[PDB]
Write a protein that binds this ligand. Structure first.
Ligand SMILES: NC(=O)c1ccc[n+]([C@@H]2O[C@H](COP(=O)([O-])OP(=O)(O)OC[C@H]3O[C@@H](n4cnc5c(N)ncnc54)[C@H](OP(=O)(O)O)[C@@H]3O)[C@@H](O)[C@H]2O)c1
Length: 314
């Protein structure tokens, strides 16, 4: 297992990163400092998580303390849906850069293929509760992303939550200048994503798996929901290898040539979750984990199911 994967912009991306969705602002600075001390070199961030300033304080202290050089870190953030307009993308990017205390991002993603009306609210609602869309299509948002590369604010651009037809629309864009480097999508044994991963990998797009532990802290968790970390069948594989269930769930995407971004704010789990370079799942174990697919999603963007660009009807 090499620690980095080559992207189609010629850069190398660490295959294990730290997620930050739902990491409280008062705990995420210490989470990111511990993560960099124990070897993480990739941090996954987003404006909509509301904690980039505190992530930035950690990154800046570890660079100032010379624990790591900026060239060895791989920092990812995401353009929120209310900034898909051409004239708002650069300012959105620069606000994230300012918050993270960086002069460039390694990777900037379109967070969802769905544009929303610009304004203060992240989810602008009509008087009945549906998201109010923006008319800007995703090909014009991609052109604005390409401008960030050419202005030196980001080294790579990519997409998140795009379905195969929407990846294909980018790939077929008239005048395309930069292909997406990454598609970040939900992926774990209950949502194995075979077809979309094979499409993206055949096009030289690297896939990042989010919610690899099934996001047990997601706000809308219902107790009858499936639970990966408590699945006896996955616990049995972990027991066979003398590893934790989280370690098997992190190693699983790594052996599919995916990047994976487990979140934790608990120092012991941050360190545990990184100790996955020392064991191998067999091909039989990988096929057995793939057989648990149920097409179950943590993140279904339920308020947007009528948006023209909603990704999950397909
Ligand atoms: N692109 C997108 O639209 C999108 C959507 C969802 C997620 N993501 C990214 O993906 C990251 C990961 O997904 P996620 O946050 O949904 O969930 P996750 O990584 O699947 O699960 C996080 C949960 O697992 C717990 N946990 C972590 N390590 C553990 C361990 N060793 N043992 C037991 N429990 C453990 C964490 O608890 P503690 O923190 O209390 O330790 C937290 O409750 C996000 O943080 C975000 O960066 C992106």
């Amino acid at each position: 297992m090499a620690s980095r994967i080559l992207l189609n912009n010629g850069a190398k991306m660490p295959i294990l990163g730290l997620g930050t969705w739902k990491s409280p602002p008062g705990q995420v600075t210490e989470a990111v400092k511990v993560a960099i001390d124990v070897g993480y070199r990739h941090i996954d961030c987003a404006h909509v998580y509301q904690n980039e300033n505190e992530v930035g304080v950690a990154i800046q202290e570890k660079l100032r303390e010379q624990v790591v050089k900026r060239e060895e870190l791989f920092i990812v953030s995401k353009l929120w849906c209310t900034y898909h307009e051409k004239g708002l993308v650069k300012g959105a990017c620069q606000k994230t850069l300012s918050d993270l205390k960086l002069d460039y991002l390694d990777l900037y993603l379109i967070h969802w293929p769905t544009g929303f009306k610009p304004g203060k609210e992240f989810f602008p609602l009509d008087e009945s509760g549906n998201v109010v869309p923006s008319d800007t299509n995703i090909l014009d948002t991609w052109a604005a992303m390409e401008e960030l590369v050419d202005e030196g604010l980001v080294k790579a651009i990519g997409i998140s939550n795009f379905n195969h037809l929407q990846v294909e629309m980018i790939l077929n864009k008239p005048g395309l200048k930069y292909k997406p480097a990454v598609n970040q999508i939900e992926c774990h044994p209950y949502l194995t994503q075979e077809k979309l991963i094979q499409y993206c990998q055949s096009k030289g797009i690297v896939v990042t798996a989010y919610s690899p532990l099934g996001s047990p802290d997601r706000p809308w968790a219902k107790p009858e929901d499936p639970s990966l970390l408590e699945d006896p069948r996955i616990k049995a594989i972990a027991a066979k290898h003398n590893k934790t269930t989280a370690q098997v769930l992190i190693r699983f995407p790594m052996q599919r040539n995916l990047v994976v971004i487990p979140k934790s704010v608990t120092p012991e789990r941050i360190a545990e979750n990184f100790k996955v370079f020392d064991f191998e799942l067999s091909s039989q174990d990988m096929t057995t984990l793939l057989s648990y697919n149920r097409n179950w999603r943590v993140c279904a963007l339920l308020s947007c199911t009528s948006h023209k660009d909603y990704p999950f009807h397909e």
